[PDB]
Design a protein around this motif. Structure first.
Motif, PDB file in Angstrom:
ATOM      1  N   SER C  50       0.854  -1.322  -0.081  1.00  0.00           N
ATOM      2  CA  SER C  50       0.133  -0.089   0.047  1.00  0.00           C
ATOM      3  C   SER C  50       0.805   1.266  -0.033  1.00  0.00           C
ATOM      4  CB  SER C  50      -0.858  -0.149   1.251  1.00  0.00           C
ATOM      5  OG  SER C  50      -1.552   1.124   1.327  1.00  0.00           O
ATOM      6  N   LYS C 124     -10.868  -2.603   0.949  1.00  0.00           N
ATOM      7  CA  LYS C 124     -10.508  -0.975   0.910  1.00  0.00           C
ATOM      8  C   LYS C 124      -9.845  -0.743  -0.258  1.00  0.00           C
ATOM      9  CE  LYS C 124      -8.016   2.374   3.572  1.00  0.00           C
ATOM     10  NZ  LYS C 124      -7.088   2.326   2.578  1.00  0.00           N
ATOM     11  N   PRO C 168      -7.881   0.416  13.569  1.00  0.00           N
ATOM     12  CA  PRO C 168      -7.111   1.238  12.453  1.00  0.00           C
ATOM     13  C   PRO C 168      -7.590   1.225  10.929  1.00  0.00           C
ATOM     14  CG  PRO C 168      -5.499   1.170  14.077  1.00  0.00           C
ATOM     15  CD  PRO C 168      -6.637   0.125  14.207  1.00  0.00           C
ATOM     16  N   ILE C 169      -7.682  -0.101  10.699  1.00  0.00           N
ATOM     17  CA  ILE C 169      -8.074  -0.339   9.318  1.00  0.00           C
ATOM     18  C   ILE C 169      -9.714  -0.087   9.049  1.00  0.00           C
ATOM     19  CG2 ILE C 169      -8.322  -2.336   7.651  1.00  0.00           C
ATOM     20  CD1 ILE C 169      -6.431  -4.086   9.356  1.00  0.00           C
ATOM     21  N   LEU C 173     -10.819   2.791   6.565  1.00  0.00           N
ATOM     22  CA  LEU C 173     -11.556   2.524   5.445  1.00  0.00           C
ATOM     23  C   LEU C 173     -12.809   3.265   5.354  1.00  0.00           C
ATOM     24  CD1 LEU C 173     -13.444   0.548   3.585  1.00  0.00           C
ATOM     25  CD2 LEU C 173     -14.221  -0.871   5.338  1.00  0.00           C
TER      26      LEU C 173
ATOM     27  N   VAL D   8      -0.537   7.492   4.156  1.00  0.00           N
ATOM     28  CA  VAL D   8       0.029   6.140   4.178  1.00  0.00           C
ATOM     29  C   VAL D   8       1.467   6.205   4.478  1.00  0.00           C
ATOM     30  CG1 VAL D   8       0.692   4.046   2.733  1.00  0.00           C
ATOM     31  CG2 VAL D   8      -1.960   4.645   2.866  1.00  0.00           C
TER      32      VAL D   8
HETATM   33  C1  LIG Z   1       0.216   1.304   4.565  1.00  0.00           C
HETATM   34  C2  LIG Z   1      -1.453   1.543   5.097  1.00  0.00           C
HETATM   35  O1  LIG Z   1      -2.307   1.629   3.963  1.00  0.00           O
HETATM   36  N1  LIG Z   1      -1.637   1.991   6.162  1.00  0.00           N
HETATM   37  C3  LIG Z   1      -3.105   1.738   6.905  1.00  0.00           C
HETATM   38  C4  LIG Z   1      -3.028   2.397   8.175  1.00  0.00           C
HETATM   39  C5  LIG Z   1      -4.334   2.384   8.947  1.00  0.00           C
HETATM   40  C6  LIG Z   1      -5.655   2.288   7.944  1.00  0.00           C
HETATM   41  C7  LIG Z   1      -5.425   1.881   6.661  1.00  0.00           C
HETATM   42  C8  LIG Z   1      -6.408   1.400   5.749  1.00  0.00           C
HETATM   43  N2  LIG Z   1      -7.758   1.283   6.730  1.00  0.00           N
HETATM   44  C9  LIG Z   1      -4.087   1.801   6.090  1.00  0.00           C
END
Ligand SMILES: CC(=O)Nc1cccc(CN)c1
Ligand SMILES: CC(=O)Nc1cccc(CN)c1
Ligand SMILES: [Ca+2]
Ligand SMILES: [Ca+2]
Ligand SMILES: [Mg+2]
Ligand SMILES: [Mg+2]
Lengths: 9, 232, 232, 9
Positions: C50, C124, C168-169, C173, D8
């Motif tokens: 990512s 996502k 956090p994901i 999202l 990110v």
């Molecule tokens: C590198 C990266 O994509 N980190 C990240 C961190 C926190 C949340 C999300 C997406 N929900 C991605």
């Protein structure tokens, strides 16, 4: 630490 | 070349758009295509060529220095060939960009540059791209350093004969030749002498300049002063 | 693939070096090669994938917006086809990077992702790269928007069932789905409702977190709050 | 003007 050479714009 | 089919004027227009977009690889490819049309470059077109390639090699040099630092730290736990391999990959691409610029200068920008402002600019560029080769050289290192020195010296000799001491090309040449002497040639005293003489001779000619010329010259003089502050 | 001959572990090592060097195109190529080994990705490897592609498409999107602005200003003195041509070139390369990421997700990262933390992350990403396609789409625009919405919705449904409101994901999202609704779907009220509900449900679960988890969640909550400040 | 999406690192 590193010196400045000509900075190009 | 992939730019053979594009009009010269369209390549210059797209180089300016690529600079606005911070697309420097594209900007360099456009300006390479423009040079390969075989016509001499105007002042503004020379500046587009230099901005494009300085930004491309600038990213490569910054990346090379991060990788060389990691590699040097590795060689002071064994982690395999990968740091060396990837530093070598970035090095080879940097060398390739430097060889491309040198090849444009040798075929045929320098030989068709008769005015001092073009000839000095191209010879400075020749010195700069040999200097960037010398930064990564370990194997012909001496001959690369001599090639940088020889181009800078010929540019210096023309600049002192043909340009006033405030001319921004002459100033930026002397700035970069002083960095060559300090960082590449292990001649810090030559570096400091050339920066001080250049600064002082320029300061004594500022009175001759318009406000806009004064601003152009003093910007570069400040870089000479910043290096002399670092070096003394 | 040009990375077929390189070990998986060496591609991951070089992706981390490329990130240190700010060589994001290289980092993306390394991580594409790692995904193409066919093994599932760990959490840290998903983050490398990512970071690499977000930085590559981020540069393309920024360049596209500068060029689209110049093009729109041209169409309000005739300067020829060059602005449109070069905006189209950058657009086609951006579309190609988005298609590459979508193709990695479809072959075969999503189907082999059974854990909520992998499956939600990939879905996502699917929504994000359809969203980036939708930013430049004018022709299938509706179907690209629906593809983004469908991926985000499936990620949302799994995240609400399987993850706490502070995860956090799940937060990132919801942040990106709210941007989809505001900027792409012309649904500003859905955007504001989803950001407010996400923020409030997360705030009520902060008490359950360690200091380090608290820092991770609150960083993303601040982005939700910044958008709600912009939008209301 | 543009809203913040996930940033990110
Ligand atoms: C590198 C990266 O994509 N980190 C990240 C961190 C926190 C949340 C999300 C997406 N929900 C991605
Ligand atoms: C774009 C560019 O190379 N500009 C520039 C300005 C001032 C001086 C020099 C070199 N003497 C170069
Ligand atoms: Ca022509
Ligand atoms: Ca293997
Ligand atoms: Mg001394
Ligand atoms: Mg309302």
């Amino acid at each position: 630490m590193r010196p400045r050479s000509l900075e190009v714009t | 070349g992939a730019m053979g089919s594009m009009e010269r004027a369209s390549l210059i227009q797209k180089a300016k758009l690529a600079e606005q977009a911070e697309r420097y690889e594209d900007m360099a490819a456009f300006m390479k295509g423009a040079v390969e049309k075989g016509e001499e470059l105007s002042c503004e077109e020379r500046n587009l060529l230099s901005v494009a390639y300085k930004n491309v090699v600038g990213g490569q040099r910054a990346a090379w220095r991060v990788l060389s630092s990691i590699e040097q730290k590795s060689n002071e736990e064994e982690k395999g060939p990968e740091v060396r391999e990837y530093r070598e990959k970035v090095e080879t691409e940097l060398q390739g960009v430097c060889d491309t610029v040198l090849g444009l200068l040798d075929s045929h920008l320098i030989k068709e540059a008769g005015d001092a402002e073009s000839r000095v600019f191209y010879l400075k560029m020749k010195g700069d791209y040999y200097r960037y080769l010398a930064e990564v050289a370990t194997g012909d290192k001496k001959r690369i350093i001599d090639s940088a020195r020889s181009a800078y010296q010929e540019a210096m000799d023309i600049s002192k004969k043909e340009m006033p001491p405030t001319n921004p090309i002459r100033l930026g040449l002397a700035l970069n030749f002083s960095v060559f002497h300090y960082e590449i040639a292990n001649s810090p005293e030559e570096a400091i002498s050339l920066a001080k003489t250049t600064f002082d001779e320029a300061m004594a000619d500022l009175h001759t300049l318009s406000e806009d010329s004064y601003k152009d010259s003093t910007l570069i003089m400040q870089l000479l002063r910043d290096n002399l502050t670092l070096w003394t």
